[PDB]
């Protein structure tokens, strides 16, 4: 078996290898990349997402989110307080202000230490889930707005035609902005391109060990667990690497820098934080191997999760027994 220790693998495709997206994902899996839950892909030197990022300041962040923490330094939840709209130019200025700017630090490890020590005492503002793309329409390779759709994948694999669309989302981050422990909707893959700015550090649990993380989460957030059998779907819980280690949870970590792609694999729990002002673009996607994960994906039916229109068809076709209960949750 390839990659039995479930290490995060890093790939350096040639420009020829970068032509066929599906083929390269399959190649990465043939090398065991999926066992980690996360892979890094460094694009060939000849490739670029777009010409420059000089003209992005007028993009609107309609609903910036202030991420307010509760709990202890290594075990906390965050809730999102809506703030007034601001442009990317305004957001960048805010990120760089004394209140929000990245502190002096020696290296990524030093910054990681500072993050886990001090995150809860601040409330950074995140521009998340903004529908759009920064890939040039003429970028033919690994253009996140030009991927085969999940609806077409489901149709190709299972013969059923379904409604729904899936398009990319932009994320504008600043120091300490945080993504909580989660897998993707319907345990899909995700792909994330860091377009510009400071790094993003990721933590990931191998898919074969996801239930170990779930069990610890139930222990650490007992009220939340009683409220919902899939409360990690709410995307609000954080657990530090120190606490994971103390509890014997298998995980890995890696830092993504501008110009790099990360792929998360079905049922690969991940969490992380931004180092400073940055912009990432991400989208969910599927492959034939995903179908079995989609069929088995846990669902939130307590009403907290609240998912996109397109998830309806996924649950309806892949999980017909769960559909009625889940749909009651959406309404
Ligand atoms: N349009 C703006 C300008 C500044 C700010 C906001 C919106 C909300 C976040 C806090 C802030 O300084
Ligand atoms: N796709 C995700 C997953 C987690 C999170 C976000 C988007 C933004 C809101 C905060 C968070 O933890
Ligand atoms: O970048 C972020 O804030 C969160 N991204 C993801 O969880 C992802 O790409 O799957
Ligand atoms: Ni994700
Ligand atoms: Zn729930």
UniProtKB/Swiss-Prot annotation:
Cellular component, GO, one term: pericentric heterochromatin
Positions with a binding annotation for Zn(2+): 228, 234, 300, 302
Catalytic reaction list: N(6),N(6),N(6)-trimethyl-L-lysyl(9)-[histone H3] + 2 2-oxoglutarate + 2 O2 = N(6)-methyl-L-lysyl(9)-[histone H3] + 2 formaldehyde + 2 succinate + 2 CO2
Cofactor: Fe(2+)
Record note on cofactor: Binds 1 Fe(2+) ion per subunit.
Domain JmjN intervals: 8-50
Record keyword Transcription regulation present: yes
Residue ranges of every copy of the JmjC domain listed in the record: 136-302
Record keywords, A-Z: ADP-ribosylation, Chromatin regulator, Dioxygenase, Iron, Metal-binding, Nucleus, Oxidoreductase, Transcription, Transcription regulation, Ubl conjugation, Zinc
A GO molecular function held by the record: histone H3K9 demethylase activity
The protein, known as: Lysine-specific demethylase 4D
Species for this entry: Homo sapiens (Human)
Lineage per the UniProt record: Eukaryota, Metazoa, Chordata, Craniata, Vertebrata
Protein encoded by which gene: KDM4D
């Amino acid at each position: 078996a390839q990659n039995p220790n479930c290490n995060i693998m890093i790939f350096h495709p040639t420009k020829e290898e970068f032509n066929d997206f599906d083929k390269y994902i399959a190649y990465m899996e043939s090398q065991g990349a999926h066992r980690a839950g996360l892979a890094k892909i460094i694009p060939p030197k000849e490739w670029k997402a777009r010409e420059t990022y000089d003209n992005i300041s007028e993009i609107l962040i309609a609903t910036p989110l202030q991420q307010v923490a509760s709990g202890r330094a290594g075990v906390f939840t965050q809730y999102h307080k809506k703030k007034k709209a601001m442009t990317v130019g305004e957001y960048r200025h805010l990120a760089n202000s004394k209140k929000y700017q990245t502190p002096p630090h020696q290296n990524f490890e030093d910054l990681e230490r500072k993050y886990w020590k001090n995150r809860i005492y601040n409330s950074p503002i995140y521009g998340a889930d903004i529908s759009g793309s920064l890939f040039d329409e003429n970028t033919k390779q690994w253009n996140l707005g030009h991927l085969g759709t999940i609806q077409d994948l489901l149709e190709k694999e299972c013969g059923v035609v379904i409604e729904g669309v899936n398009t990319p989302y932009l994320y504008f981050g600043m120091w300490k902005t945080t993504f909580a422990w989660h897998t993707e909707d319907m345990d899909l893959y995700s792909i994330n391109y860091l377009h510009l700015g400071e790094p993003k550090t990721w933590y990931v649990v191998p898919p074969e060990h996801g239930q170990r993380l779930e069990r610890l989460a139930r222990e650490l957030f007992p009220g939340s667990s009683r409220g919902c059998g899939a409360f990690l779907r709410h995307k609000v819980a954080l657990i530090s690497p120190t606490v994971l280690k103390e509890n014997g949870i298998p995980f890995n970590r890696i830092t993504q820098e501008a110009g790099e792609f990360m792929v998360t694999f079905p049922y690969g729990y991940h969490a992380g934080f931004n180092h400073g002002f940055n912009c990432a673009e991400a989208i969910n996607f599927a492959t034939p191997r995903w179908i079995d994960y989609g069929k088995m994906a846990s669902q939130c039916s307590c009403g907290e999760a609240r998912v996109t229109f397109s998830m309806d068809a996924f649950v309806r076709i892949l999980q017909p027994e769960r559909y009625d209960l889940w749909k009651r949750g959406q309404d």
